[PDB]
Every structure is written in structure tokens, then in C-alpha cells.
Write a structure and sequence with these properties.
alpha+beta; viral release from host cell (chains A, B); 2 chains; part of a larger assembly; viral penetration into host cytoplasm (chains A, B); zinc (chains A, B); two-stranded antiparallel ribbon; metal-binding (chains A, B); three-stranded antiparallel beta sheet
């Protein structure tokens, strides 16, 4: 079963003829194709698709460092789940260790291993080519419970493993790695993640994703063709402006025509000839125009239309990649497109890595804050009216408490205490004079 | 192994026929080419690509000096990792030494060695041509643990070394330098860095990067062709405006025609002839127009389109390099393109150089601050209400404490202490009169 024991079927009830009994084929949406990822692999060098992948992965790479060490606060942090909790002495260190582990992508430092930045750039590229992310989790050999590394794996090699009954394996070796159409490795759900952005309930989708490259493939082909068309004017075309027709009772001999070519070029070619005019006394002379006097690119609107569609599927403003936005206006779309990718990476990290440390922690990317010394002083300038005595503030600075602190900085607070002092001095007088009268009587 | 021992294969399982058993070839994306960097080397003189490389490396060069000595605060600094730590007496000097070492690119001063500026300009050029940065680390001959120099190395000469089993070497001499297709040097991971901006999980990518010159190569070729086309009007073209057809019962002899050319030029050429009109009494006279009356460049939109694509791959505004932005609007893109390059250089420096000094330190580029004397006085003008006595402020200035300091500059603070004084004088009176009554009784 794909998810678990259920009485609704979640896979094709009759076993479709997969090429191999051991794994589920990545069939195209229409089943017109069975090797979809080798189709999509051909577009991974497309310049528009790479402009999208590079702009997004450059945006993502800025978060990869820890916010803890980044004075602007931009980055990621490992945090307790509850905002109300205060972390214990050991929890603060465990969170710092998990942060360090993520940064190093593993327990020890090793320059030969990917950084978290390289990992994120990899999986972003994989999401936007394949809509499939995989990374292997490597556990300590002596202690299978202890995670040592996580490494990104080529998604085109990873397939769901299938039982002889055609059911997807659960609980066992759920995944296989296939190279040259033989299984070279296998993995449990514990050892390999799979992440998908565009899920489907469709039974024949078999749990695989859906690439925008598949959806937009016609548009990419049309783009490629219009690019080749415009380039072939130079690469393959006839640029010839026209034909100079000279006509007389009979055509010139080839010798005559070649020394007429010498008369021409020695008198009229280049800068040296540039403003001379030939005189010719042929019976008639005509020039036939075969091209426009002013050539430029064609199908510009067609290209714009195509790229507006492809950008709309990926959720990017064409203006970000150098194309007119046919909507005619518009940052908001950048935010709307980048935030889901960040959340997807967060979801993967939380489910697969942090879950080794248990549910008390959470991994989140965090933006900066507008909490300068000025802003903190404005806040405390209100908190000292509302809450804080001078000495609480100074203690929060690590500055020694002062005699004459322990007061709120409000004139009414002091006017109250000045009242209460008099109240005390009156009750003291009243009670002492009562006692003195009782002792007199 | 590329990264480390793993059960997922990270390289082509069957050894592909590399040209040499000893190193991994830099195959093109489609494997259409095996000598990719000698292809890319031909574009390193491209004017558009150099306009990008020069504008970026000029932007980067401003950071290269230390912020410590730069009164505007712009530059780099070596810092403790934790923002909460206060550096020890020896740590402050070690950080200054590491800064000096970076500036000098080595232990001693030597005018023959690259400065950090020259190093950064080099590796920026290398990133944007090859997407591969290499620098060698040279250790002291007497003490292999002590770093003496780091020097940038030609990335086109550096290849991954491969075992006889076709596996990339790890732990040993991971890198070789190849010149004239023979190995002239070898390096461990300790002795040579490799940096890559555009990583791939693709098994056949073999750990190498992906140049935008490779992706955009068709666009660069189209650009080159359209430039040659527009130049060849002058360099090679016929600029001839038209043919003056004069016609009569028979063509003039060559002698007649050459002395007609003398009659023409002596009467009509240059400024001297400029406003005279010839009278001619031929049977018929015709002028055939062979070019437009007003010539200008062609395919301007095509060029703009191409450069907008190339700029979008590199992440630069065309307006920065003298082209219309086809998006029609837009600094933000400059920031978005320069910040990743800075972070990449930071990541390389942290992983490879600072790591010799251990994880307690961090290298970062830092911008200036808006912390003039005015801003500091505004901040302290609030801190002296919220936190600081006069004497703490003066001590922070190195100015002697004054009698009548030790007070917060708030009227309520003084009104409180003026209360508390009276409170003391009352309790003093009460307690002394209590004692005097006890002694009387």
C-alpha cells in the first residue's frame, strides 16, 4: 500500500504492465510515455527554465546560514515548538548542535561534503525540473539509531519498489535506485525521503509528482522553434537584398562578367568606394527587391505570450526574467512564489531530519526584524511607564541596580507612593496616640 | 567517493570512457563535448560577458579592505561567531592577525603577491567564466600545520583525480593539475579548494558546475552573428546608392567615358562642386536605387532580446550594461545579484581559511552604519532616560565621573529619591524617639 491499510483502492486495481516487476514506472500523464524523466532531462539546459531555477535558488541561498550568528537575523533557526516554553540548559545546547549539524549537513565538518547551501540549490533545481526531491539519510554503522549524514540523491534514479502482487511496498524496502534499468540499491522510508509539490489523487499517478515542464512542454517546443526560426536568418538564410538585372541582346561571357566584377570592386567596394556612383549604359537596368529594407525579429508577441504562460505556471513575474508582463502591471508575485518553496523545504526538514530529535523542536526559516537599539529603546520607553522599574531594565542590561530604582517612570506612580507615605505616617500617629490613651486610662 | 561512503551511487555506476584513467573529464551537459572549458575559454573576451564581469568585480572590490580601519565601516571583518560573546585579550589580537593575514593574503607582506582585491577580482572572473573557483593553500615547510599563503589557481587546469576503479579519490590526492593533458601536480582536499555556484545532482555531472556561458551559448553566437552582420555593411558591403543609367544608340568608348569622368569630377565633386547641377543631353537618363535612402542598424530588437536573456541568467539589470530592460521598469536586482556572490566568497573563506583557526571565529563582509555622533547622541539621549547615569556615559567617553552624576536624567527619578530621603528622615525620627521613650521608661 502507498499510505497504509485502507478499504478504498489507492492504486490501479488490475496490475498494469510495468516494464519491471520490481518497481513502479514513471508513466506520463496520458501514458503516452513511460520514461518521462528522460524526456524532462532534455530540458534541464533550457535558458528560460534555468533563469527561473537560478533566480529562485539564489533567493533561497540567502536563508541557508543560521540567523543566530547573522546579526541582521536573516537565516534559519532551530527552535522549540511552543512559543510559550523557555528552553532548558541542555535544550539550548541541543538546538545549537542541531543547527550546526544542519549547516555542516552532518555530524563532523568535512569540506568534501555539501554545505546546506549546496543541498538547497540542488533540491530546488530538482523540484523545478522533476518535481521530485530525494535525499538519503546515513546512520552510524555502530548505532543504527544515530543519524550521521544526509545527502541529496539523483531523483531520476529513484523509484517506488513494488511487490510481486504489483502493490507498492510499505514497511519494507519502499524505495529502489535503478541505474541502466537494474536495481543498484534499495531503501526504507527511514533511509530515503521523497518530496512532491504537485500531488494527485489520480490512481494511475501512482504517487509521483507533476512537473510544470510536462504541462508546459508544448510551449517550450514552440519557444525553441521560434528561436531557431529567428536565428536561421543568419545561420542558414538568404540575406540577399535583391537581384541587379542588367539586360541586353545577349548575356555577357563569364570572362566579361568577371572583369566587370573587377571594375566594380576596384571602384565601389568598402569605405574606399563608398560614395561613388557607377555609370552603366546597358539597354535596361533593374533591381528586384527580395527582402524588406529593414529586417528585425519576428513573432515577438508569440514569444512573450509563451513565456507569460510558462512564468504563470511557475509563479514568477515575467518582468523578473526580462519579458513584458502581459498583465501590464507588477514583488508580490516574487513573495508568493518563493514562500511556498521555503515552506516545502521546511516541511521536508521537519518530517525527515528534526524528527530524529523528536517533536519538541521545530525548524523554521526566519526573516530579519526591525528591532534596532532605537526600536528597543522606544519599546522600553513605554515598558518603563507600563511595567518596568529602572532596576529591572538595568538588570536586563546586566547593569547594577541603583538605590532609587524600583520605581515606574510615571509621575502618578510617585504621587501615589508620596500619598501612601503620608497615609502610613497618619496611621502610625493615630495608633500610637490610641495606645498612649489606653495606657493613660 | 565524491562526498563519502554511501549506499546510493553518486557517480555513473559503469565507468564511462574518460580520456584518461587518472582524472574525470569535464563533459558538456549533453556529452556532445568533452573539453568544455576550452570551449568556454573562447568567450572570456566577449564584451557583454566582460561588461558583466567587470561591473560585478568592481562592486566586490570595495569590500576587500577591512572595515576596522575604514571609518565608514564598509569592508570585511573577522569576528567571533557568537554575537553574545566578549572577546578575550588574546582573541582580539588573533582576530586582528587573521584580518591582516587575509589582507596580505599570507603571513608576510610581499608586493609580489596578490592582494585580497586581486584575489577576489580573479575568482569573480573565474566564477562567471567557468563556474569553478580554485585556490591553493601553501603550508609552512617546517610545520605542515601552519598556513602561510593562499593563491588562486587556473580552474581550467584542475580536475578531480580518479582511482583505477573509476571512483573519485577521497581522503588521498583528490585533485590533479593537468597541463598539455599530463598531470603536473596533485593536491589533497587540505591543499586545494573547489567552489561551485550551480551544483547538480545529475550523476553524470560528476561534481562539476554549470556555466551560464554553456546555457546561453546559442544566444552569444546569435549576438556575435548579428554584430558581424551589422558591421559588414562597412567592412564588406556594397554601400553603392544606385546606378546612373545613361543610354544612347551605342555605349561610349572607354576613352570618352574617362574624359566624361574628368568633366564630371572637375565640375561637381566635393565642396567645390557641391551645388552645381550637370546638364546632359543623352537620349534618356535614369537612376536606379539599390539601397534605402536612410541606412541604420538592423535587428536592434533581436539584440535587446538576446541580451535581456543573458542578463536574466546572470541576474543583472540590462539597464546597468546599456540595454533596454524589456520588463520596462528597474537597484534591487543589483543587490539581489551581488549579495549571492559576496555570500559565496564568504562561504569559501570560512570553509577553507578561517577553519585553520577553528570554529570560534567567522569571516563576514559588513556594510556601513548610520551611527554618526548625532545618532549616538540621540541613542544616549534615550539611554540616559532609560538606563544610564551621567557617570556611566562619561566613563564610556573616558571622561572623569562627577559628583552629582549617578542619576538618571528623568525628573521622576529625582522626585522618587527626594521622596525616599524624607522617608529615611521620618523613620530615623520615629526610631530615635522610640528608643528615647524606651530609655525613659
Amino acid at each position: 500500500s502507498l499510505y497504509g491499510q485502507q478499504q478504498a483502492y489507492a492504486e490501479p486495481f488490475i496490475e498494469m504492465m510495468d516494464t519491471n516487476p520490481e518497481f513502479r514506472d514513471k508513466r506520463s500523464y496520458m501514458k503516452n510515455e513511460h520514461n518521462l524523466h528522460d524526456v524532462l532531462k532534455k530540458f534541464g539546459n533550457n535558458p528560460i527554465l534555468n533563469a527561473i531555477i537560478l533566480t529562485r535558488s539564489n533567493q533561497v541561498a540567502m536563508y541557508c546560514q543560521p540567523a543566530r550568528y547573522s546579526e541582521k537575523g536573516l537565516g534559519f533557526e532551530v527552535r522549540l515548538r511552543d512559543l510559550d516554553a523557555e528552553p532548558g540548559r541542555k535544550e539550548k545546547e541541543e538546538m545549537k548542535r542541531i543547527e550546526d549539524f544542519i549547516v555542516n549537513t552532518g555530524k563532523d565538518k568535512d569540506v568534501d561534503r555539501d554545505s546546506f547551501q549546496t543541498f538547497c540549490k540542488k533540491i530546488v533545481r530538482d523540484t523545478y525540473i522533476y518535481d521530485q526531491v530525494n535525499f538519503e539519510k546515513v546512520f552510524n554503522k555502530n548505532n543504527k539509531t544515530k543519524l550521521e549524514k544526509f545527502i541529496a540523491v539523483d531523483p531520476s534514479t529513484i523509484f517506488y519498489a513494488t511487490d510481486k502482487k504489483g502493490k507498492i511496498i510499505k514497511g519494507g524496502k519502499r524505495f529502489v535506485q535503478v541505474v541502466d534499468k537494474r536495481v543498484v540499491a534499495s531503501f526504507t522510508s527511514r533511509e530515503l525521503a521523497m518530496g512532491i509539490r504537485n500531488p494527485r489523487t489520480e490512481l494511475s499517478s501512482s504517487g509521483y509528482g507533476l512537473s510544470e515542464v510536462e504541462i508546459a512542454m508544448k510551449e517550450f517546443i514552440a519557444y525553441n522553434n521560434t528561436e531557431s526560426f529567428n536565428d536561421r536568418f543568419f545561420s542558414h538564410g538568404g540575406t540577399t537584398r535583391g537581384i541587379l538585372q542588367i539586360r541586353s541582346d545577349q548575356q555577357q561571357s563569364q570572362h566579361a562578367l568577371e572583369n566587370f566584377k573587377r571594375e566594380w570592386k576596384s571602384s565601389l567596394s568598402g569605405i574606399n568606394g563608398s560614395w561613388q556612383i557607377p555609370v552603366v549604359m546597358a539597354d535596361d537596368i533593374k533591381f528586384v527587391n527580395m527582402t524588406p529594407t529593414a529586417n528585425d525579429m519576428q513573432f515577438e508577441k508569440w514569444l512573450n505570450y509563451l513565456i507569460n504562460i510558462i512564468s504563470a505556471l511557475y509563479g514568477i513575474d515575467p518582468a523578473e526574467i526580462g519579458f513584458p508582463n502581459r498583465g501590464g502591471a507588477t514583488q508580490q508575485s516574487q513573495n508568493k512564489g518563493l514562500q511556498p518553496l521555503l515552506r516545502f523545504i521546511e516541511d521536508l526538514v521537519n518530517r525527515h531530519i528534526i524528527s530524529e530529535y523528536g517533536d519538541k523542536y521545530t525548524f523554521q526559516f526566519v526573516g530579519g526584524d526591525t528591532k534596532s537599539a532605537t526600536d528597543k529603546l522606544n519599546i522600553l520607553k513605554l515598558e518603563t511607564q507600563i511595567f518596568k522599574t529602572v532596576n529591572e531594565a538595568r538588570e536586563e542590561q546586566g547593569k547594577k541596580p541603583i538605590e532609587g530604582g524600583d520605581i515606574i517612570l510615571d509621575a502618578s506612580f510617585l504621587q501615589g507612593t508620596a500619598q501612601l507615605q503620608q497615609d502610613k505616617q497618619y496611621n502610625d500617629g493615630k495608633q500610637k496616640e490610641r495606645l498612649q490613651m489606653m495606657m493613660s486610662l
